[PDB]
Amino acid sequence: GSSGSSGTRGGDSAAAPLDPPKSTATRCLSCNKKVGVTGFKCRCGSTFCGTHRYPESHECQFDFKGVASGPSSG
Ligand SMILES: [Zn+2]
Ligand SMILES: [Zn+2]
């Protein structure tokens, strides 16, 4: 057996999916990868990694400037 503990309190959390107070973290929205701070915020608010930071890579839910087209992957 071993001893140890880790926890944070406050209003740091910037983006996170609908989850209970049991635990909260920051990960990508497509690869659910630990992005923490390095994460790249998007117009939709969500947080992605340096791989899915761009919109074209991740179907941005937030309607860009309202107008919508929906680019299909040939
Ligand atoms: Zn990602
Ligand atoms: Zn987005």
Contact, 31 vs 51, CB < 8 A? yes
Paired with 29 in beta bridges are: none
**What six digits make up the tokens of 16?**
């996170």
Q: Can you name the residues that pair with 41 across neighbouring β-strands?
A: 47
Q: Which experimental approach was used here? A: NMR
Domains observed in the chain? 1-74 (4.10.1110.10)
Indicate which ligand has the atom closest to the C-alpha of 62.
2
- Taking the CA of 41 as reference, the closest ligand is 2
Those residues whose beta carbon sits under 5 angstroms from the ion ligand 2 are: 42, 44, 60
* C-alpha 42 – ligand 1 centre gap (Å): 12
**Rounded-to-integer distance, Cα 51 and Cα 38, Å:** 12
Three-state secondary structure call for residue 69: coil
Annotated binding site for Zn(2+): 28, 31, 42, 44, 49, 52, 58, 60
